[model samples]
Target: TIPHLAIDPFSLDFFDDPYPDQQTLRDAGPVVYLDKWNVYGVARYAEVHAVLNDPTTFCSSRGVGLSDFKKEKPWRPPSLILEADPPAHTRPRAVLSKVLSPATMKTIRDGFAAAADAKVDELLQRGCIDAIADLAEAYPLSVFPDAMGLKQEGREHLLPYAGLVFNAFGPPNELRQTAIERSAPHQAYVNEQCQRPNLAPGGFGACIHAFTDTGEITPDEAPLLVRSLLSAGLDTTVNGIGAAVYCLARFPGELQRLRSDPTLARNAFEEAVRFESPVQTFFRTTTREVELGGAVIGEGEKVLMFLGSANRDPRRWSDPDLYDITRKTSGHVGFGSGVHMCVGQLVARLEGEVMLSALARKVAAIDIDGPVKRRFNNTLRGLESLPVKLTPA
Candidate 1:
């Protein structure tokens, strides 16, 4: 018989501290039916990986959230890359793949590194500060908007807009309601910036618009593609950096390891992402009757893949709970796997690496100074206020 667990994964209490609940779901069975939400959950690493890689079986077209797009109208237009499947997903993915490819990243590397270093220099002046607001939020907000060619005004809306996007992935609750109400102005600002003429040249946004000339994507599709960047670009990196700072502060040894081997800065960032996955949960709908873990799930059922749980699954990593900078974090699903994996992952990594490497070079130690506060959204895990004292190298 299938295991049925009555757990509300989206409640404020659960979001506050989810590890115990996640462990329960993982230990219950390979696939547990979440009785409260009526969704099947795959919390173990193996099953969650399988679901993410097998997009054919677990489709995203119906909406990668609790609401089935086929039955209910989406609150907004669906993302071409994220909400799309195979044939429909092909072109947008291809265009973005090329736009953000490693070769293209080379063009922006120097600029990104310089911006990160400059931001770090400013933060170092204040020996004690909130890592979340001062470093994590400030770093990405500094460079990402310029990379996207966004105008100077209204750039502050980026984080809230992304917070709105991530929260809506869960059931209609207060979090989602609050996000919906608060995100209007931010969303409007983002919509205006995505227009072709509003974008500056020599940036990803303009490059996306250029795809229209080649007939790869229509004019209508270009801005939506840019909107994908707007939706995903900043928040992921902000939280990723936040997670890294939180990890290094708690594990001073790991910060020492990073400081000694500055080359490991990127690895530390990746490990931090695995240690505390920023984007936590995403749903995939079953395309047809499918057998998973010897249990047959009916067609159109929602399968919530606990990415955070999967990353920390003891079955996958020995000492999975430890925040070790030396750990090999290659296959971790901090970024979703397979075709629908985060298209913006490379950019996120580049930003993380630049900022982390800069800090590793400049800071001797990272220590928590005051009470830490968590910023909870339905889909993202991050700190709202992480007060810390930095000792200069």
Candidate 2:
């Protein structure tokens, strides 16, 4: 028999503490029925990874949220790349993949490192700092906009815009509605910024638009691709870096390990991503009747793959809860997997790598200065506030 659970993953109760519920889902069976959302859940690594890898069988065109795009009209236009399928999804992804490839990241590595060192030095001088406000949010906000060729004045709009974007991925609950209302002005700014004229001549946004000139992506499709980057880029990395610093703060042993080998900083960040998965849950609708873990799922059924839960599944990882910098985190679905895997991951890892490396080399010890505040979002797990005292080495 299959496990049937009445879990409302969208409600305040679940978000406050999801681990126990996640454990129940993972332990109960491979395919657990989340009756509240009328969706099936796959918490184990095997099922989640398989579902992600087989995108054609379980598609994304029908809206990744609970509301099927086939049934309901999206408030904003669905993402050109993230929410589209096949041939439509192909070119947009290829264009941006080349634009944001790890090679391109090297060009900005020196610039990113310079900013990381400057921020770390400034924070060390301050002694007591809010890691969330000072480092995680501050660094990405300062540098990412420049990379996108966006102006400095309206950069604050990006956060609420991102909040609305991710929150919209869930049901039309109070959180989603509230975010929609609050993010209107920010959304307008983001839309305007996505246009080619607003972008600088030699930046990622310009390069993406250049694909239009080469006839790879259409002129009409280019702005939406830029908008996709605008929506996805800032918040996810903010949470990733926040998660990394929070992990080090909670586990001094891991910080010690990172300090011993600054090169481990990159892996330290990767482990942090696995330890605390930032982009937590994404829904994929089934294209055909499928049998998963002996449970039969009908075509068009919504299957919410728990990326965070899969990372912690004991079946795939040893000491699944422990935060270890040396852990082999390559298989974790923190950034997701397969065709629609996070397009901005290289940038995310590059940012996390540079920031974590600088912290490891410059800071002696990190201890919590006070209680940490968790920022609850529909799809992201991250700290809202982390007050820490950094001792200069």
Candidate 3:
């Protein structure tokens, strides 16, 4: 076991307001041993970049979650694209990339914009709304199901199922156990629909099936391939949208700036992702005995990559904690970097851009009516509820 490493830092109380801990880790060194999880971690931007991009040195086959991939008792199978290395991850990611192309993304943008405007319109009429649930969560649940070509019925279970999948990435604690119990029965329901008959005509899932016809992906692997889509698709954007809206509400001047130029819709989402990163932390394993920033990480050692911390590292950005829409943010690691960077990022952007722009188009301004609450998960930085008052345009 590695010495001097905290066993479960992400689950700790101090991690709630984590910039101090991040500073401590970065100052402590590039690679510190965590005794409890038998791992090493890299908290700085350079070290995290090396870990993410140098796939040969820091392998992903160990999976991108807290658990060790090589362990006999790994939590779940490697995610088709998120878990596997080179050759295996390549085709699946490529197939998904083409399927969610710019044109395909644009197809849904208008409808998503309309849906978001309608939801905001409802919220404005109501005068008060839980921004997270009523708008952010509601928007994706409305549009993404159609994009997937999955029939809209009973799609409500998709987000909780995704929660179960992500929670499985952490240690087997009460949260993981509770999520598993809640999602088990629904699991079969979610899986069965990935079949060809279940895929709606011309949906993303059907496009995945077409890969079988083209001899790109095997028929046997299709369901798991589609499962990868369903797994990564739903809750992430919901939290992201909610988180962005909450961030704007928290900093009203930013909202006004966004109001002044409606095109800031895309920038607003990107800035929120930069400021309050959604997917906070994930892990990778050292494939060899390698030295990182003066510390040696032994082969097979788990290394946590703090994307959220890196996004806020003052060394990388001036006044790292402040939310600035105009900051030069091209290098942020929010969607990750290198080969395993998020394939669905364009779809995610379009979803947010369309929805947020629609809301901005219809609402003169939105004000916080209550506290901004957060939901903590090991792999996700998410807003649980954000209460706001919307005044109509």
Q: Which candidate number maximizes lDDT?
A: 1
* Predictions: Cα RMSD each: 0.9, 1.0, 1.9
lDDT of 3 at 87: 81
Candidate 1 on 1-393: residue-level lDDT in tens?
Answer: 789998899987888999999999999999999988899999999999999999999999999989999989987899999999998999999999888989879999999999888887787898998999999998898888998998898887888899999999989888998888887798789888889999999889999998887767899998889999999889999999999999999999898889889899899999999999999999999999999988899999999999999999999999999998889898999999999888888999999899889989999988898999988899999989999998889
Instruction: Provide the lowest-lDDT 10-residue window in model 1.
Output: 210-219
- Give the Å error, residue 308, model 1: 0.6
Candidate 2: residue 21 lDDT (0-100): 86
Mark the regions of model 2 whose C-alpha exceeds 4 Å error after superposition: none
lDDT tens digits by residue: candidate 2, 1-393: 677898887777777788898899999999999877788999999999999998888899898888888888987999888888897899889999998998889888899889998999999999999999999999998789998888778888998899888898987788888888887799889999889899997788888888997767989888899999998999999999999999999899889889889999889999989988988899999999999989899999899999999999999999999999998888899988999988888899899999999999999899999888888788888888999999999
Per-candidate TM vs. native? 0.98, 0.98, 0.95
Clashing pairs in 2: none
Give, for candidate 3, the lowest lDDT window spanning 10 residues: 1-10
